[PDB]
Design an enzyme around this catalytic site. Sequence first.
Site, PDB file in Angstrom:
ATOM      1  N   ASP A 293      21.646 -10.573  21.383  1.00  0.00           N
ATOM      2  CA  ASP A 293      21.750  -9.144  21.655  1.00  0.00           C
ATOM      3  C   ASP A 293      20.646  -8.728  22.601  1.00  0.00           C
ATOM      4  O   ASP A 293      19.644  -8.112  22.197  1.00  0.00           O
ATOM      5  CB  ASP A 293      21.708  -8.378  20.332  1.00  0.00           C
ATOM      6  CG  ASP A 293      22.918  -8.639  19.482  1.00  0.00           C
ATOM      7  OD1 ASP A 293      24.026  -8.759  20.080  1.00  0.00           O
ATOM      8  OD2 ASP A 293      22.764  -8.697  18.222  1.00  0.00           O
TER       9      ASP A 293
ATOM     10  N   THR B 208      27.910 -13.155  21.707  1.00  0.00           N
ATOM     11  CA  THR B 208      27.599 -12.222  22.776  1.00  0.00           C
ATOM     12  C   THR B 208      28.139 -10.816  22.479  1.00  0.00           C
ATOM     13  O   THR B 208      29.084 -10.647  21.711  1.00  0.00           O
ATOM     14  CB  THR B 208      28.216 -12.697  24.122  1.00  0.00           C
ATOM     15  OG1 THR B 208      29.639 -12.855  23.990  1.00  0.00           O
ATOM     16  CG2 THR B 208      27.591 -14.029  24.596  1.00  0.00           C
TER      17      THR B 208
ATOM     18  N   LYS C 200      35.173  -7.010  18.525  1.00  0.00           N
ATOM     19  CA  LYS C 200      35.719  -6.147  17.461  1.00  0.00           C
ATOM     20  C   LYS C 200      36.955  -5.376  17.924  1.00  0.00           C
ATOM     21  O   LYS C 200      37.053  -4.154  17.797  1.00  0.00           O
ATOM     22  CB  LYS C 200      34.654  -5.170  16.979  1.00  0.00           C
ATOM     23  CG  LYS C 200      33.456  -5.850  16.329  1.00  0.00           C
ATOM     24  CD  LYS C 200      32.311  -4.863  16.180  1.00  0.00           C
ATOM     25  CE  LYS C 200      31.442  -4.881  17.467  1.00  0.00           C
ATOM     26  NZ  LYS C 200      30.429  -6.004  17.331  1.00  0.00           N
TER      27      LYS C 200
ATOM     28  N   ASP D 179      42.565  -1.957  17.689  1.00  0.00           N
ATOM     29  CA  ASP D 179      43.623  -0.997  18.058  1.00  0.00           C
ATOM     30  C   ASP D 179      44.965  -1.678  17.989  1.00  0.00           C
ATOM     31  O   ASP D 179      45.075  -2.832  17.581  1.00  0.00           O
ATOM     32  CB  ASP D 179      43.334  -0.437  19.449  1.00  0.00           C
ATOM     33  CG  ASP D 179      43.986   0.947  19.721  1.00  0.00           C
ATOM     34  OD1 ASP D 179      44.873   1.381  18.951  1.00  0.00           O
ATOM     35  OD2 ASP D 179      43.535   1.577  20.664  1.00  0.00           O
TER      36      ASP D 179
ATOM     37  N   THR E 273      47.477  -2.533  23.228  1.00  0.00           N
ATOM     38  CA  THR E 273      46.202  -2.222  23.857  1.00  0.00           C
ATOM     39  C   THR E 273      45.265  -3.426  23.829  1.00  0.00           C
ATOM     40  O   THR E 273      44.675  -3.788  24.867  1.00  0.00           O
ATOM     41  CB  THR E 273      45.568  -1.012  23.177  1.00  0.00           C
ATOM     42  OG1 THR E 273      46.368   0.127  23.511  1.00  0.00           O
ATOM     43  CG2 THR E 273      44.118  -0.787  23.636  1.00  0.00           C
TER      44      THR E 273
ATOM     45  N   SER F  44      28.132  -5.859   6.777  1.00  0.00           N
ATOM     46  CA  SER F  44      26.797  -5.948   6.213  1.00  0.00           C
ATOM     47  C   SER F  44      26.118  -4.605   5.997  1.00  0.00           C
ATOM     48  O   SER F  44      25.068  -4.536   5.339  1.00  0.00           O
ATOM     49  CB  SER F  44      25.916  -6.798   7.135  1.00  0.00           C
ATOM     50  OG  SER F  44      25.830  -6.253   8.436  1.00  0.00           O
TER      51      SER F  44
END
Lengths: 257, 257
Positions: free
Chosen positions: B37, B60, B92, B95, B99, B150
């Site tokens: 990150d 990533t 993540k 939708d 899409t 988490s």
Amino acid sequence: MELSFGARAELPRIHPVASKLLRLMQKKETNLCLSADVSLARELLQLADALGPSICMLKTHVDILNDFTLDVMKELITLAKCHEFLIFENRKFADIGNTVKKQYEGGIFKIASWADLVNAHVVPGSGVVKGLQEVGLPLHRGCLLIAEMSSTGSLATGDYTRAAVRMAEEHSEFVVGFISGSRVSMKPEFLHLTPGVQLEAGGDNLGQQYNSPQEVIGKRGSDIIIVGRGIISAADRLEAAEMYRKAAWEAYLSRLG
Amino acid sequence: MELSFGARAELPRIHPVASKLLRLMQKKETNLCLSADVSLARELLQLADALGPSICMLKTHVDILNDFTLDVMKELITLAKCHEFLIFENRKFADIGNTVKKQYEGGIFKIASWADLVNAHVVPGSGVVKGLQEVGLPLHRGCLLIAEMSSTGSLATGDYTRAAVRMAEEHSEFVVGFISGSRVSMKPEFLHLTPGVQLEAGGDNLGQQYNSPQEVIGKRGSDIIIVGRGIISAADRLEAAEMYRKAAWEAYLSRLG
Ligand SMILES: O=c1cc(CO)n([C@@H]2O[C@H](COP(=O)(O)O)[C@@H](O)[C@H]2O)c(=O)[nH]1
Ligand SMILES: O=c1cc(CO)n([C@@H]2O[C@H](COP(=O)(O)O)[C@@H](O)[C@H]2O)c(=O)[nH]1
């Protein structure tokens, strides 16, 4: 009882972005949000210019634009100001607060620099809102929480939807409404935006389900329809947008009585 | 009973991407996924090169890279092949299928062209997997479903988690495992990757909560730890990675007996 968009724009607890939106909806007689799901900047901009007068909002997926640059977004902003519509980036932030804050501000897209509105899934808990707020509040932006989804098998139901509503109502300084299929908050200061809308019955082959503007605005009590392929796949996109605008607007008026 | 990563790599129903991963985990004695990150391509690449030998995977967030280009990803792939780790883009997707298929293939990032693995939230229903599969299956890619999170207030619990597990198990040609806090599937062909990991107790100020490698691998039965700030904020990132690797690996061995 129910207030006009114009009156809702003046509510004591209204967010400034919501107010701006509600005022232009009333002025322009439009509660249509164009879902500009195209891959070419030129098409995006030509749609924005031609359809701008007919829409209260233009929803983007900047990550499917093959030729994204920040200059494209500058040109989009020029059209948004000219025609009076808000820009909503359908980013669906959906991680821990520390991550989403960077995703909102940074990277190549710099979403917070041009997007009036973004949205977030509520699955991570309220940290997703807190992280986004750290960037969006200083930049005078708003957020929508995804309380319900239009697609087959959606898990955004029941207690999940209730949790989204609570999270919005507890973060009213930044959260201005919902992506939902119906009115889910009883507080008029929040906007309800509903995707999965076409005039004709149907769906797509990947779980999308459609309902009409009269059903979602009239019967289900939502505020704004989000329409993509119903307009974008049509030959005359301007006429299509006008059909959707007039449908959503009259459904709104009739519900107002 | 429980099989080694090496044996799991050979299971009849194993996905090829899972198999490649499991084999390199065993060869290298690492079940550590670095969460890279960072905002600078040079830092990303210098971390990938120095830490490559210590990790089974590099996760990533390409949308926080200030200087993303596809050439950066080419260089990352060179390191991944050299050091033997997979690339996981923590996109993540969340939708409707129509899409997400475009988001996966297209746009500036072309995620499907370089990412061995991606992940998706299950909230939209199984259409999110079906859409992604249309791009990922031809490109021989894998997907992880987010079954648990988490962060404080996570709604990925109970029936939601069960729904994620079912969705994975019903789409085994493309879905290879989970982001989760614990073992959630009883089928050994699926990988469990767990974020929210540090050696010391704590959290962050935006809802992240930490548990140790021994807790998540040893007691909770997960396979791989995902570690960001525990490594990235450390002075010596190589040493930090080695500490996390040795912790996660021994927890795995002890659980194997
Ligand atoms: O539950 C949802 C949530 C979203 C987020 O707005 N959407 C989005 O609305 C648009 C619907 O487009 P369509 O009218 O072409 O189906 C798409 O951009 C889709 O990603 C949905 O279709 N359903
Ligand atoms: O439930 C989740 C899901 C994700 C997706 O992998 N993550 C991600 O792991 C990483 C944890 O980083 P940290 O070790 O610095 O907290 C971040 O990139 C965060 O976005 C989590 O931290 N928790």
